[PDB]
Amino acid sequence: MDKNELVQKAKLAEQAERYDDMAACMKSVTEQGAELSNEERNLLSVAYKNVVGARRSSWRVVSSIEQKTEGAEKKQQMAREYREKIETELRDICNDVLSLLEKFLIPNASQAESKVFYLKMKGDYYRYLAEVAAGDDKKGIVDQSQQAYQEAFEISKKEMQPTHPIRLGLALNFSVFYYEILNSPEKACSLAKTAFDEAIAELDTLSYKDSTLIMQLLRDNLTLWTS
Amino acid sequence: MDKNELVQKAKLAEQAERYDDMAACMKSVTEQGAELSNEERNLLSVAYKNVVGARRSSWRVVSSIEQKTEGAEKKQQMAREYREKIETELRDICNDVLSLLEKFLIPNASQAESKVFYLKMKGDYYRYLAEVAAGDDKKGIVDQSQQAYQEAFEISKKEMQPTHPIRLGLALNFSVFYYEILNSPEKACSLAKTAFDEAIAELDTLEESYKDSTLIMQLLRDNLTLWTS
Ligand SMILES: [Ca+2]
Ligand SMILES: [Ca+2]
Ligand SMILES: [Cl-]
Ligand SMILES: [Cl-]
Ligand SMILES: [Cl-]
Ligand SMILES: [Cl-]
Q: Which parts of the chain are coiled coil (chain B)?
């Protein structure tokens, strides 16, 4: 399977909702070492989002059951063991994505748009590791997530317009990092509100649907977190 | 791996929407050789329905895309080879289930209700093989589906009330077999209509678990509406 063929396969897999197949294809395209097109970048992101997402969803159910059963040490041990099984799958997915980002995607990123996208992505996957991390390793994983988001944030602020969907998307995920991982709701609200207001101010420079959708998500989090 | 632990793992897997895991647990439960409870056979059924379902849905997308490629032999060979990969996964799942049905489930079925349930299931999984079958094998696959359903149909008419959810569910799936596999719309409609009408008549003449029965009745009528253009 050569590049164009692997991309058409990934697109078939997407249509079939066979996301592990989709991820395998785009991993192989990425490993050929050439900078990904915008289309290929999105295919990779969609694939791994769904692959990791399935495990995250499962983890939340099994972790919720574990702690909603007071006593009954046979059933709690089972849920704990199944959570751990799911965690191993999730960690290996995140480490595969994070290895692709270090080796290929971030160093080859020749546009600010691309570099911000991949650094945001690095922040996300370290955040998914942080969701599942045990106390000892957690602080290091959380700092790795924060630094990836922060570098992405610096670059988008300098290079991209406030209405750009990748700049707005970064503000959404980084604000979520602050609220959910760092337990810093004031910082989360400040980041979200600033991104929203700066986008509102610069509505002259737009081209659209994605941008205003993310702005709505930002304000929804503000109202949720304010109450 | 004791029976009770495996059942609780299957329930965890179900909540996690990890249906391969769920099917593996219930496969192991079934292979211990003891007759399954109502709860256990439903867990087995739900697990495998979802496991095969994923591949069936994927097959319909990739098969459609293969037919939609008018003039592109490179993209069409790709779609065909991916369909074939999906088909082999699908057949292996169906044959797993059908093997559990022959070896353990149908032999140990001590009640008419469970006999009908497992024969319907046999009909379903041969029907899924029939959906994916090429001309050579298809006639034999289709006949095994029909014979499984037909035996289930006869036992259900003799032993169960018209409003029993298993009897109604059989009528639904058997009518779908006639419509989609044998292309016999008139037989599909008549089977589905008499099942609906006989259930409606039984509500007047005296039913316990309304919900499942009445839901299947709605699905029977929906098919009758769809199949009459
Ligand atoms: Ca998959
Ligand atoms: Ca699964
Ligand atoms: Cl897959
Ligand atoms: Cl998948
Ligand atoms: Cl699974
Ligand atoms: Cl699944």
A: none
CA distance B211 to B140: 37
CA distance linking residue B3 with residue B35, whole number of Å: 12
Instruction: Provide the CATH number for the domain around residue A218.
Output: 1.20.190.20
Alpha-carbon distance of A104 to A70, in angstroms, equals 47
DSSP string, chain A: --HHHHHHHHHHHHHTT-HHHHHHHHHHHHHT-SPPPHHHHHHHHHHHHHHHHHHHHHHHHHHHHHHTS-S-HHHHHHHHHHHHHHHHHHHHHHHHHHHHIIIIIHHH--SHHHHHHHHHHHHHHHHHHHHH--HHHHHHHHHHHHHHHHHHHHHHHHHS-TT-HHHHHHHHHHHHHHHHTS--HHHHHHHHHHHHHHHHHT-SS---HHHHHHHHHHHHHHHHHH-
- As a whole number of angstroms, the distance between CA A158 and CA B12 comes to 48
Count the domains in chain B: 1
Resolution (A): 2.1
Structure solved using which method? Answer: X-ray
Q: Which residues of B touch A (CB under 8 A)?
A: 5, 8-9, 12-13, 15-18, 54, 57-58, 61-62, 65, 75, 78-79, 82, 86
Structure tokens at B144: 């095994």
Q: Which two tokens stand for residue A35?
A: 């900078």
Distances (CA, A) of B194 to A220, B187, B209: 52, 11, 21
Tell me the residue type at B54: A
The CA B18 to ligand 5 mean position distance, Å, reads 4
Tell me the shortest Cα–Cα distance from B21 to chain A, in angstroms: 11
As a whole number of angstroms, the distance between CA A133 and CA A141 comes to: 8
A11/A47 Cα distance (integer angstroms): 10
CB neighbours (10 Å) of residue A71?
7
